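Reviewer comment 2.1 asked that we show a complete input and output for one of the modelled complexes. We chose the zinc ion case, as it is the one discussed in the main text.
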Amino acid sequence: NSNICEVCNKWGRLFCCDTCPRSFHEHCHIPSVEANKNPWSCIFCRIKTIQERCPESQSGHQESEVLMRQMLPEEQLKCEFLLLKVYCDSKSCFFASEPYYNREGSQGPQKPMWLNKVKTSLNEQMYTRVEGFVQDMRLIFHNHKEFYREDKFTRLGIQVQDIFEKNFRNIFAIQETS
Ligand SMILES: [Zn+2]
Ligand SMILES: [Zn+2]
Ligand SMILES: [Zn+2]
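Response of the prediction step:
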């Protein structure tokens, strides 16, 4: 296996996948690495299994249909995976913890949102449809763009949103368009 965490790229106390070479810190994996389970398979492997069991799951879908799906176990897992793909980028650090807003000429958002809040919400089964998870993830980047206005720091929100959206389209097999 790898000797660094797949998510944050640091060494430390690592848990190794039994079915692929990836490794994880306990709370870098989502869900947090499970206490027992020998063998253990990582979220990458669990997602690959879903795909391999239902090859048709990779055919194109409409976003509006995906958003309305109830959060049954496979959709829960897919949203956990999508959240983990965003943490995989180092720029996620800007969006992880609870923000605060005190900038001349701007007012904070009405509904602050951040990655660790979405993580807790998934863990606590607070989302009943894919739509709830996706709306809170998009709200993170929309809040940032609105607050930073013309400051060049706005670009960090575009960047991390692009990682979210590309992974959303991949994981949920959204129909390709121009
Ligand atoms: Zn890590
Ligand atoms: Zn694995
Ligand atoms: Zn089948």
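The chain is about 45% helix and 5% strand. We note this here for comparison with the apo prediction described in Section 3.2.
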